[PDB]
């Protein structure tokens, strides 16, 4: 059996849900070294460890504007850190160093320590935070997943990036459009698994309001990559429909991964 999977078999009912089957607490970082601080989530349950997720801030944001994402993901069993940058216009490649540091934090030195498996962990991140997956990932191609949403870098060449990939797009964003962004991020990646859904009529602002097409996807990501939970291959692959009237306007993947 697989050690890491956690909840109940899931539907499409479960990975849409605001509120996944575990309870929540949060506190905020204090003390934290390499990174602004922030707030962090985490099952209640201490019946088991979870993996982690590092979420970094993206448009001269804080993590306020992503905090909704603390309880939906945390609530599917996972850890979740969500940070403040050092600098709120720190470029790409600072935000990657300080998803690093923030899970450095988590596992070594936070309240929660022992509530995380260090060995499974994953970093997302919003318009700039999502360029910082670059740096996260070549720094660390032992994370397990990167979730980059909106992601804005002005280097175009992920081609280096081992680690499975998910980016979401918008098809209204102007900021970091997905021809100019994250399209050509996912059309350079050739060694690692990847996952690219773009959002009908979204502009640079979809991550910053609950959103149930990308949380489920996201969702999804999570427990495939960070648990090793293939129960979640099923609505990976094939994926959203790409209809006229869908939520989802473009979709392209490495099914079956």
């Known amino acids: ?108 030195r936070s309240p929660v320590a022992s509530r995380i498996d260090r060995t499974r962990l994953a970093a997302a991140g919003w318009s700039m935070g999502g360029g910082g997956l670059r740096r996260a990932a070549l720094q660390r191609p032992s994370l397990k997943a990167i979730v980059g949403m909106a992601p804005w870098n002005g280097e175009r060449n992920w081609s280096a990036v081992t680690v499975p990939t998910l980016f979401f797009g918008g098809s209204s964003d102007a900021v970091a459009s997905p021809n100019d962004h994250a399209k050509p991020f996912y059309n350079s990646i050739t060694r690692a698994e990847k996952d690219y859904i773009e959002l009908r009529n979204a502009d640079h602002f979809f991550p910053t309001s609950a959103n149930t097409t990308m949380a489920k996807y996201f969702i999804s990501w999570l427990k495939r990559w960070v648990d090793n939970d293939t129960r979640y291959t099923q609505f990976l692959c094939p994926g959203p429909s790409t209809g006229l009237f869908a939520p989802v306007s473009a979709s392209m993947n490495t099914c079956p991964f």
């Open 1 to 108: 059996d697989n050690p890491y999977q956690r909840g109940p078999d899931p539907t499409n009912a479960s990975i849409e849900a605001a509120t996944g089957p575990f309870a929540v607490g949060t506190q905020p970082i204090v003390g934290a070294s390499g990174f602004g601080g922030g707030q962090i989530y985490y099952p209640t349950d201490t019946s088991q460890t979870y993996g982690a997720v590092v979420i970094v801030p993206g448009f001269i944001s804080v993590w306020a504007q992503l905090n909704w994402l603390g309880p939906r993901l945390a609530s599917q069993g996972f850890v979740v850190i969500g940070i403040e940058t050092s600098v709120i216009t720190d470029l790409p490649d600072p935000r990657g160093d300080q998803a690093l540091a923030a899970l450095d934090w988590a596992t070594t």
